[PDB]
């Protein structure tokens, strides 16, 4: 009765960074959550993470850097059009200088700044700042 695994993954990272920990354990892995983590590793919020490959669903250990404020999730995967995208920005970003609503487009899991470099509106998947 794990209806969303991206919601559970990002909740566990959020509880540990406010706790002060340097490593988390994300017990179910999916390719949706490794492409979620390789959007915030590239922007620089988390560090080296390992996928622990087992023969059932793998685990992930992430090295928390400390630069993460909140890494929440929008659990109904709402659809966002590029006309609709700017009002999703000012609802759930703290500022316009930093933070990303990361959303799944047809051409891959992207930013919102990367998504409007292209022209490829999609489904909003989560946010982090």
């Amino acid at each position: 009765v794990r209806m969303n695994v991206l919601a559970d993954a990002l909740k566990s990272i959020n509880n540990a960074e406010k706790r002060g920990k340097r490593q988390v354990l994300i017990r179910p892995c999916s390719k949706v959550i490794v492409r979620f983590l390789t959007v915030m590793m590239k922007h620089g919020y988390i560090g080296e993470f390992e996928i622990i490959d087992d023969h059932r669903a793998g685990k992930i250990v992430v090295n928390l850097t400390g630069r993460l404020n909140k890494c929440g999730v929008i659990s109904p995967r709402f659809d966002v059009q590029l006309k609709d995208l700017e009002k999703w920005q000012n609802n759930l970003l703290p500022s316009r200088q930093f933070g990303f609503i990361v959303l799944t487009t047809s051409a891959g899991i992207m930013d919102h700044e990367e998504a409007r470099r292209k022209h490829t509106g999609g489904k909003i998947l989560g946010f982090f700042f």
């Binding site: 002060g20 850097t65 400390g66 630069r67």
Partner: protein, 82 residues
């Protein structure tokens, strides 16, 4: 804080904790900054310099500054090396 002109428009830059990477605030009066005087190699006495490490009060109140300041002595060549 590096505007588009490229200038510092900011009253100061705050410290941040060498344990949990978070900002020491302006009135977090449990945050320590303390020195560790390293010793020279051959004679084992105080040589003059030191190293500073800032521990914020929220991670100092939680009770693991000793776990902290050993671990950043662990990375910086003072502890035991085992």
């Amino acid at each position: 804080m590096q505007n588009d002109a490229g200038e510092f428009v900011d009253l100061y830059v705050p410290r941040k904790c060498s344990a949990s990477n978070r900002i020491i605030g302006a009135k977090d009066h449990a945050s320590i900054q303390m020195n560790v005087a390293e010793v020279d190699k051959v004679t084992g006495r105080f040589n003059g310099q030191f190293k500073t490490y800032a521990i914020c009060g929220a991670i100092r109140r939680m009770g693991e500054s000793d776990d902290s300041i050993l671990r950043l002595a662990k990375a910086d060549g003072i502890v035991s090396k085992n």
